[PDB]
Amino acid sequence: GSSGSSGTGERHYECSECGKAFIQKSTLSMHQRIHRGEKPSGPSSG
Ligand SMILES: [Zn+2]
């Protein structure tokens, strides 16, 4: 076999809440904030 696609370009910091992608880490934090806050119970039925 032949594979190895780990090293083409430059890693990036993408959000883990929504799934957005950013070039810089700090820049991402400024966004992730939007997620910072309260969250729903979960079992919300309806
Ligand atoms: Zn996000």
Curated annotation (Swiss-Prot):
Its localization reads:
Nucleus
Q: Please state the residue ranges covered by C2H2-type zinc fingers.
A: 13-35
Coiled-coil residues are none
What is the role of this chain?
Answer: May be involved in transcriptional regulation.
Q: What family is reported?
A: Belongs to the krueppel C2H2-type zinc-finger protein family.
Protein name per the record: Zinc finger protein 484
In its UniProt entry, the species of origin is given as Homo sapiens (Human)
List the gene name.
ZNF484
The residues of the intact protein that this chain contains are 547 to 579 of 852
